[PDB]
Amino acid sequence: TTYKLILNLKQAKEEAIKEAVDAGIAEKYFKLIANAKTVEGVWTYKDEIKTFTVTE
């Protein structure tokens, strides 16, 4: 399914999307860019709409 990511650090917010039934696959990408763009924070994911979010 079309997943949605939102990375938070302070002000600017980054986005990411991944279409796949294997939720674990999206987090891999979400963490792929979250690690490439972001650094580290509180990782969370919603099942109601398949959306990953991080807060620093």
C-alpha 27/C-alpha 45 separation (Å) is 9
C-alpha 21/C-alpha 14 separation (Å) is 23
Of 3, 7, 1, residue with least CA distance to 31? 7
What approach was used to elucidate this structure? NMR
CATH hierarchy code of domain 1-56: 3.10.20.10
Say if CB 45 and CB 51 are below 8 A apart.
Answer: yes
Residue 33, token pair as written in the block: 């860019």
**Residues 6 or more apart from 19 whose CB is under 8 A from it?**
1, 2, 3
Region label for 5, one of left (φ > 0), alpha (ψ between -120 and 50) or beta (otherwise): beta
Of 45, 47, 48, residue with least CA distance to 6? 45
